[PDB]
């Protein structure tokens, strides 16, 4: 049905990435990050040239002061681990609060528009130098915000 | 997802309240639907002058309900001859994940909420955007919005097609305002905007020298 443009698709409605990481083998020596976990958000009734004209896409969340542009993590490693969000271009850090860069990466599939995002965990430069990251769970939240013009 | 049937909402100041329809569009997880209002600067305001309730509610998969928009007495402090800008936000929080090391993504929809004083109530048929004035200036056009309303411009071109396609960073004009947008010169300017209903009409301008007006 054609109404309410670029709304999030029912399928890409419940997104979440699960990082498979080990303290000593991933956060103690460079690069000091986990492999990129990929999650895709598909916008329905949305088209190429119209994106930036109809809606802005932003990831909001608590920033990790030690890693500007990264999300804070909760639990024992709070302040040691940061979550990096990769924009659709597969390289640019999509800092929290900043909008997604129109263009590169987006895939125009059908009447919809898929947004292949990436996320990875990374240690604070100090948390890495000191090898302070401990085995143990961490959690992080992010809000994908659709702002309509 | 918690569906916001339209892209904006106008609050008729003549009314004491109005309802906004929402709904969980996922068929699995029940959602916690947070609804709140931000001011023109997008800062959350829970005190007023515009209120949204309930602040949170549970929405089962595919269920629908509402959020009530109402005003406090201090709404009277807002100008009565022009619109005041607010934002309605709907964020849907899913159940926490039991898994470990997870990035929880919540969806949020932010739409403009125009507070329209009773004095500037518009006829359902009225089209005030045809009062917009385009002035040719070095580098583009000076768009002036002499109306009492906010006007969102999403396209400037020389034909109805160029206005709908042509690269253009949408821009919003406050009531009795003006600003310049970079643009190519077009013999007969065509401007596209978004109206109360989400319709994206295009306007035809006729230029008498460097001053263009809607024909």
What is the resolution in angstroms? 2.4
Domain at B1-121, CATH class: mainly beta
Contacts of A54 in chain B (CB under 8 A): 7, 154
Mutation target to probe the A interface, by most A beta carbons within 10 A, among B2, B9, B101, B165 is: B101
d(C-alpha A36, C-alpha B192), whole Å:
40
* Contacts for A129 with CB less than 8 Å, ≥ 6 apart: none
**Phi, psi of B131, deg, nearest 5:** -100, -5
- Thinking of the domain A1-149, which architecture would CATH place it in? Sandwich (2.60)
Q: Which CATH superfamily is domain B122-213 in?
A: Immunoglobulins (2.60.40.10)
Cβ neighbours of B139 (radius 10 Å): 10
Question: Three-state SS for B107?
Answer: strand
d(C-alpha A143, C-alpha A101), whole Å:
17
Contacts of A16 in chain B (CB under 8 A): 97, 102-105
- Written as six digits, the tokens of A51 are 């994106």
Q: Do you know the residue count of chain B?
A: 215
Triad B197, B199, B205: Cα angle to 5°: 125
CA atoms within 13 A on the CB side of A145: 22
Please indicate the experimental technique that yielded this structure.
Answer: X-ray
Boundaries of every domain in chain B: 1-121, 122-213
Which among B168, B120, B160 has a CA at the least distance from the CA of B143?
Answer: B168
């Amino acid at each position: 049905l054609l109404d309410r443009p670029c709304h999030v698709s029912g399928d890409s409605l419940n997104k979440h990435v699960v990082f498979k990481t080990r303290a000593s083998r991933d956060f103690w020596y460079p690069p000091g990050r986990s492999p990129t976990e990929s999650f895709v958000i598909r916008l329905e009734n949305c088209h190429a040239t119209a994106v930036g004209k109809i809606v802005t896409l932003t990831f909001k969340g608590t920033e990790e002061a030690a890693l500007p542009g990264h999300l804070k993590v909760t639990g024992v490693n709070a302040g040691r681990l940061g979550i990096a969000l990769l924009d659709t271009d597969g390289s640019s850090l999509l800092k929290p609060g900043t909008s997604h860069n129109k263009g590169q990466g987006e895939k125009v599939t059908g009447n919809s528009l898929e947004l292949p995002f990436g996320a990875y965990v990374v240690a604070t430069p100090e948390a890495l130098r000191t090898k302070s990251v401990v085995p143990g769970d961490y959690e992080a939240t992010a809000t994908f915000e659709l702002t309509y013009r | 997802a918690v569906s916001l049937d339209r892209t904006r909402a106008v609050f008729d100041g003549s009314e004491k309240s109005m309802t906004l329809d929402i709904s969980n569009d996922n068929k699995q997880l029940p959602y916690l639907a947070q609804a709140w209002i931000e001011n023109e600067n997008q800062e959350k305001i829970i005190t007023g002058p515009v209120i949204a309730t309930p602040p949170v509610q549970r929405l089962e998969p595919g269920a629908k309900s509402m959020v009530r928009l109402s005003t406090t007495p201090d709404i009277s402090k807002l100008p009565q001859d022009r619109e005041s800008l607010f934002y309605f936000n709907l964020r849907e929080i899913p159940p926490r994940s039991e898994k470990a090391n997870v990035l929880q993504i919540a969806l949020q929809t932010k739409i403009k909420l125009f507070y329209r004083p009773a004095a500037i109530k518009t006829r359902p048929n009225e089209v005030w955007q045809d009062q917009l004035i385009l002035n040719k200036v070095s580098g583009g056009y000076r768009i002036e919005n002499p109306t009492p309303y906010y006007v969102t411009v999403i396209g400037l071109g020389g034909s109805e097609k160029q206005a709908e396609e042509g690269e253009f960073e949408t821009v919003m004009l406050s009531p009795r305002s003006e600003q310049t947008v970079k643009s190519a010169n077009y013999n007969t300017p065509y401007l596209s905007y978004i109206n109360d209903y989400g319709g994206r009409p295009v306007l035809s301008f006729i230029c008498n020298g460097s001053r263009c007006s809607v024909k």
